[PDB]
């Protein structure tokens, strides 16, 4: 869900960047 960091969904909701959501 939104609260899952490992999903790109999460890093969207969490507003972060990482292995699963680059820039």
Partner RNA sequence: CCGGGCACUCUAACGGGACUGCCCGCGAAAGCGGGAGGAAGGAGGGGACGACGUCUGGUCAGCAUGGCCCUUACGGCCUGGGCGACACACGUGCUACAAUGCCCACUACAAAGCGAUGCCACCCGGCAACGGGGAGCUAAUCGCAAAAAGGUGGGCCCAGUUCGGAUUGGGGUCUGCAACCCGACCCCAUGAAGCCGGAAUCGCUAGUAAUCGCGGAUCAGCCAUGCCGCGGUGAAUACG
Residues that bind RNA (CB under 7 A): 1-23
Query: How near is the Cβ of 19 to RNA at its closest, in Å?
Result: 3
Query: How near is the Cβ of 10 to RNA at its closest, in Å?
Result: 7
Q: In whole angstroms, give the CA distance from residue 19 to residue 8.
A: 9
Helices (H), 1-23: 8-13
DSSP lists the bridge partners of residue 18 as 21
Both tokens of 9, joined, read 């969904």
């Amino acid at each position: 869900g939104k609260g899952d960091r490992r999903t790109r969904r999460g890093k969207i909701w969490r507003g972060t960047y990482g292995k699963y959501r680059p820039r």
